[PDB]
Each structure stands twice: as structure tokens, then as C-alpha cells.
A = this chain, B = another copy of it.
Amino acid sequence: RRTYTLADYLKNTFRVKSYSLRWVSDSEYLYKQENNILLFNAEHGNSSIFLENSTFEIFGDSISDYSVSPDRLFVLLEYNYVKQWRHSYTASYSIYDLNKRQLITEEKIPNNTQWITWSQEGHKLAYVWKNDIYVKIEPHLPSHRITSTGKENVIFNGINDWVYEEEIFGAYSALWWSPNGTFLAYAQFNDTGVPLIEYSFYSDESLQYPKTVWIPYPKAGAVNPTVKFFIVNTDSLSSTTTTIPMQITAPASVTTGDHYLCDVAWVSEDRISLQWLRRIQNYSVMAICDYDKTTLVWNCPTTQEHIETSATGWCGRFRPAEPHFTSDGSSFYKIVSDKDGYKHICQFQKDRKPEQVCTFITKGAWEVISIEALTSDYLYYISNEYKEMPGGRNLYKIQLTDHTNKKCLSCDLNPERCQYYSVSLSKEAKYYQLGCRGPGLPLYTLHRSTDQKELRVLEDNSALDKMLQDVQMPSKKLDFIVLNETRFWYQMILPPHFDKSKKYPLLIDVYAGPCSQKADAAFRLNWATYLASTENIIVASFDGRGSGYQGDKIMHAINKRLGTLEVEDQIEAARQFLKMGFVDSKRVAIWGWSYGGYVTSMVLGSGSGVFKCGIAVAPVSRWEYYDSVYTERYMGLPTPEDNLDHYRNSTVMSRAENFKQVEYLLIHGTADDNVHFQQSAQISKALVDAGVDFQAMWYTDEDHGIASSTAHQHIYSHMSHFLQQCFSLR
């Protein structure tokens, strides 16, 4: 008879478990249990201690993470983790020798490393420190410095500058070991002409004068950083004081103007795959380069060029998809849009072919989410094909020799509980583990790939289940509405004993950025759960135009003009929800974070009269303020020669007037390096000039995520009270 309190959410009262394993081979995996890394044998539950409750304690309680060398001989112990940006951070490291049973203490690794990684083979280490790359052929041996051009906020060797880390790679690392570890490829970035953004950091109240953080950040249209790709021969390190890395230069069709390095992918140890993109992500080129043993040079013949294009928008979902080469790198499978605009899997031959470079191996009005593995005879992938549910996720399997032999491996399993699967195959797909994120409580099981026999259940949230028994959980409808003759999915978090006859207040949850998906079949315990279970508020999300994985027709619909259709469609969907009867039209709200805050604001300022109040957290107010790689992908360049008009037209401040008809709560982090605060500061000023009263809230020194513990609780409590006040509740 107890409800799901905001405290339950903020204090993470009801923990949801999972089974994050690490395939160490084609048949064994590592698993952390009671702070003990155990080696498990897929097949027979056969287990065994790998690292003990012990070890980890030497480095006290600061052991941030661990990385086992592929040959399982050493373990990297991360500690002193200091975050910086979405994925970047610096730590301290120690190499533990499993065999000799103790910490290597000789040629230690610098106490402020920005990135480190094992080779794919033995115990080779490559790490970036002070923006320069270093290599240690073996843990006990000394470091060999690979670069020295490294310089803060200027030259990045082996790590990404701000925009690359955020918009292109989504990772800090810019290193790539070749298979067998002979070479080490890396990218270099020059942030020289890139302009700076500078925000204040107050720190402990003891700091008398606030700090100033500056970051080379390119806003739409600004000068971007530049790139260079190198591959260095890791073997010759012992015979020189300095090795000379060879450089690969981007293809001619990309060099005429600004461009980016899209993706890196080693094919074999004498072949590497590189994808390049033009600043106007209209065009993309994936070159395949071969190592010339004679002239000790890499060649990227235009015969193996391969061009990807888009006349509807940009390339790929957020960037060209990654290639998956056959064992002998003669061919590769890659997800690309078919004639109908549906992201599917098709085959390529190393050498390009005149307007027939592909052969689609998948067809349908659904899309392939990702290629999970490629055996010598099978291609395992994940799609949203089943039951025509774009919001669902299932694991499939096609036989290379026979494209008709296509079988779903999770569709049957638990149709009730599971409709959203995540996968994880062993080193050679002998076994696989399924992650049911599906409708019901998450369920983890592993199966033998041959016959799919479910060897055993790794984790079923029985524990959680027992607890949620004494609690009044809300439900989640996941259906679709049809507009202009097209299906448009949505979801709703209905409060407990939801009576379709009564009328509840509605809260629209938004994001709606290009290729986003807020309506899916995944189980979650968030603030929306609290809102329905205790405030009796229906929280609903709607994936409209410019969204999800439903073909380019729908996604590219927003091209060159954000702050348009995705905004309208959000309003339209609310109307449709009202027509569904059980919504108290006199109490409808809308909120969102980042892109979501933008749309919230764009909706509240639409004067549509449909919404009472709204909350925007770290919203974008006008695209010229946001970074280049992201903005330009959908908006082009903010110049009169391109899309300047649409830029200036989609401003939030341009709608300050319409805010008089709404209660608005603007929240922004003070140290937000992603969405600059400048954005909200610009919005509040616009409303002040418009004589529109509203509520604001800044979070001192908080990130783009406002995710520090106290801040996290504070911001949700404050928003809760805002809704309570707005919905006449409390």
C-alpha cells in the first residue's frame, strides 16, 4: 500500500541489478562479485577467483577501475580518477603482476595519465600523458615517448580535443592498436585557430578569487580544429631513441576544405580502415589503406575509396556507421540507408564498384540498430524489426552463405517481460549473454550459440521483485498514434490504479533531438516513476518527426531546420493525448534537459495555449551558441550563403512574449562546458526585456549533468515542488 516516494528515487532505495561480464576468451569471462573478480566458465557454472577482496584495498578505497591485459598476465589498477568533460578524466595507475603476485614498481606510469590501454594481444601498453603518447612493450620496461608536440589546449596526441570527444568519437581516446600489435595508429588535433569559451569556477568557499576555465570550443560556423593521422611502428622502438611515425593523409575529395576524421578500424595488421567527413556532413569517404613492406609506407588507393552520401540530410545516424571486415578483409558489412531510406546491412568489396558498391542483406520498414558480431559464417545483429516495434530491441542472426537463414534469437524467450535486448557475445561468438532491459524487470541469461540452449540465468531481479511487491508501481503503455497517415509511437507512465474514466494531470517528457527515441520498451525507475506512483501524474513521451530509427524520411524530416516539426509534433501529440479523454486539460506541463529543454522552451513560447507550465534544464537557446560538429550536421553553416535564416528563426528568445501565458522554470549549471549557460543567460535576459516574470535557478559549479550528489537531489526536489505548485497539488 506504499507509493514510490521522491526519496525512493533520490536515495536509490530500490536497486536494479545486472550482469556486466567481461569476455576474456571464447569461453571464459570475468565478473566482479563481492569486490572479487571471478573467472567463470561459460557452459558449466564452473567459477574461480581471479583477483581478491584483497589487492584492491592496497590502493585503499580510491580504486576507480581495473583493466586486465588480454593475455591475462597483468592488471591495470586505476585510482585517483578526476573527471573532465563527458568522457575525459585523468587517473593514477599501477600494474599488478598476476604471475609474480605483486605490484610492478619499476618503470611506473606517470601520476597524471589522460589515457591508457593494452594492445589487443599481449601486455603492450600505450598511454597519453601531457598530451603526448608513450609506449611500454612490457610492464617492467621503460616508456618510449612517441610524440613531443603535445601541448595543453593546443596539440592533442592520442586523445581528442573537446568537440571530437563529444561529437565525433564520444570517447577520450584517439589511439588504435593494430591486431598483433606491430603498429599503433593515432590521431593528432591542432586547436590553434579554434576560439575559446571561458566560465567561472568558484570552488570551496575558502578560495578567495574564482578560477577561470577556458576551453577551445568551436561554436557553429567558427574555425574548427584540424586533424592528422599517424601510424607508428611499435617494434623498432628498442633500436632507436626516436621512431618516425608515418602519416596517412585524408582522401583528395575531403582536403579542399574543413573536414573531420570519422572513424578508425583496423582490418588486419597490414590494412586499416579510415572514415572521413566533410564539414558539411553531406559527403563521407571510407578509405582502406594497405601497408607497403618495401617502401615502408601506407597506401590508400582511390580504388578502395568508397563514398557515402545523403541528399536528404547528413550521413549515418550521428556519423557514418562502422565497417565490419571479413577474416581476410576482402569484404565488409556496414549499416547504410537503402533505396527507401532504411538503415540496413549491406556487403562491400575492398575495391569500390561503380554505383553498386553495396548489396543489401536486409530489407524492410524497420532498421538494423547495430552489427554485434561477424563469424566466418554468421552475422549477429540487433534490430527493431519484431512486432513492428521501433522501440523494441532483439538479437538476430543471418547465415552469410544463405541470407534466407535469418533467425531471431530473443523474440520467443520472454515476450511478456522482454522486448528490449542488449547482447554480448564471447570472443568468437561461441556463447552469448542476453540483457533483457525489456518491459518487465531486467533479466540476464547466457546461452550456447550453437543451439541457443539457455545454459543458465545470470540475474533475474527477484530481489527487487520481492521489494516492489509492497509498493504501488505505475504502469507503462507503449503504443502509437497516427498523424498524416504515419505511425508515431509514444509511451505513458500511468499512476497505479489508473482509472481510464477519471482525469489526471499530464507531464510531457521531452528530448526530441534528431534521431532520438523517448518511447521504447525499456524498464526504468526514475523521477517519472515517482511522479505517477505518488503524485498521480501521467508522464508521457512522444517520438515525432526527426526522430528514432524509423527511416530517413522521418529522421531527416527536420534537416536544415531544427526548432520546427519536432516542436510542433510534440504539441500535436499532447492534443491527441487530451482527446484520449483521461487528461485534465487544465493541468498539462512539459519539461526537458539539453535538447529537451530547448523544445520545452520552444513549446512554452509557442503560445499554443496547450501547456500551463514547463521546466527547461540547461537548454539551448539559439544554435549559434552550440558547437560546430553537432549543430552544422543538422543546420549547415550560419551564413547568408547557407542557412543563416533558419538559425535566426529558431531562437528561444524570439518567443519571449508568448511566455506571459505560462509559468516557466529555467535551470542551468554554472560550469556547463557543453551547453554554455550563456544560453540560459540569454533567455532570461530576453524574458526580462519582455516583462515576463518566471523562475530561475543556477547551480554553482555544476556540470551539464548537474549530477553531483547534493545537486542531483536538490534539482529534482526543486522541480517536484515546481510541478506541485503548478498542478495545484502539494
Contacts and interface: CB of A to CB of B under 8 A. Distances in A.
B714 A685 contact: no
Interface in A624-678: 624-625, 651, 653, 670, 676, 678
Interface stretch (A40-48, A199-207, A330-338, A403-411): A199-207
A676 B700 CA distance: 14
A617 to B, nearest CB: 14
Contacts of A693: 714, 717-718, 721
Interface in A170-198: 195-198
A699 interface: yes
A698 B717 contact: no
Contact of A696 (B197, B202, B696): B696
A219 B209 contact: yes
A397 B22 CA distance: 94
Main SS class of interface, A: mixed
Contact of A691 (B200, B678, B695, B713): B713
Nearest to A697: B696
B688 A711 contact: yes
Contacts of A622: 205
A681 B700 contact: yes
A625 B682 CA distance: 27
B210 A678 contact: yes
Contacts of A701: 681, 685
A686 interface: yes
Contacts of A111: none
A77 B197 CA distance: 40
Contacts of A624: 208
Which has the most chain B C-beta neighbours within 10 Å: A621, A651, A700, A717? A700
A212 B209 contact: no
A65 interface: no
Contacts of A700: 681-682, 684-685, 688
A578 interface: no
A613 B227 CA distance: 56
Interface in A683-730: 684-686, 688-689, 691, 693, 695-701, 710-711, 713-714, 717-718, 721
Contact of A685 (B202, B686, B695): B202
B688 A714 contact: yes
A373 interface: no
A710 B698 contact: no
Nearest to A221: B208
A710 to B, nearest CB: 5
Interface string A195-239: 111111010010011101000000111100000000000000000
Contacts of A209: 195-197, 219
A198 B200 contact: yes
Given A622-B205, A686-B205, A200 B695 contact: no
Contacts of A219: 208-209
Contacts of A684: 698-700
Nearest to A713: B691
A726 to B, nearest CB: 13
B717 A625 contact: no
A212 B699 CA distance: 20
Given A209-B197, A700-B684, A678 B202 contact: yes
Contacts of A686: 205
B682 A202 contact: yes
What bracket does the count of chain A residues touching chain B fall in? 35 or more
Contact of A651 (B205, B210, B653, B682): B205
Nearest to A654: B205
Contacts of A208: 219-222, 624-625
A717 B199 CA distance: 30
A195 B621 CA distance: 34
Interface string A504-544: 00000000000000000000000000000000000000000
B199 A200 contact: yes
A685 B222 CA distance: 34
A199 B202 CA distance: 12
A240 to B, nearest CB: 44
A196 B699 CA distance: 24
B202 A200 contact: no
Contacts of A696: 696-698
A173 to B, nearest CB: 28
A95 to B, nearest CB: 38
A220 B1 CA distance: 58
A684 to B, nearest CB: 5
A686 B685 CA distance: 26
Contact of A670 (B198, B681, B714): B681
Given A695-B695, A697-B696, A710 B688 contact: yes
A527 to B, nearest CB: 16
A696 B669 CA distance: 13
A718 B687 CA distance: 12
B681 A202 contact: yes
A85 B198 CA distance: 23
Given A200-B199, A200-B678, A710-B688, A653 B205 contact: yes
Contacts of A221: 208
A517 to B, nearest CB: 31
A622 B621 CA distance: 34
A123 to B, nearest CB: 44
Which has the most chain B C-beta neighbours within 10 Å: A202, A670, A685, A699? A685
Nearest to A717: B693
B691 A710 contact: yes
A488 to B, nearest CB: 33
Contacts of A681: 200, 202, 670, 698, 700-701
Contacts of A653: 205
Given A199-B200, A210-B678, 16 more contacts: A196-B209, A197-B210, A205-B651, A205-B682, A208-B219, A212-B212, A670-B681, A681-B701, A684-B698, A684-B699, A689-B710, A691-B713, A691-B714, A693-B718, A693-B721, A696-B698
13 contacts: A195-B209, A196-B209, A197-B209, A198-B212, A200-B681, A202-B685, A210-B678, A681-B700, A684-B698, A684-B700, A691-B713, A693-B718, A695-B695
Interface of A: 195-200, 202, 205, 208-210, 212, 219-222, 621-622, 624-625, 651, 653, 670, 676, 678, 681-682, 684-686, 688-689, 691, 693, 695-701, 710-711, 713-714, 717-718, 721
Which 5 pairs show the lowest CB-CB distances between chains A and B? A685-B700, A681-B700, A688-B714, A689-B710, A205-B682
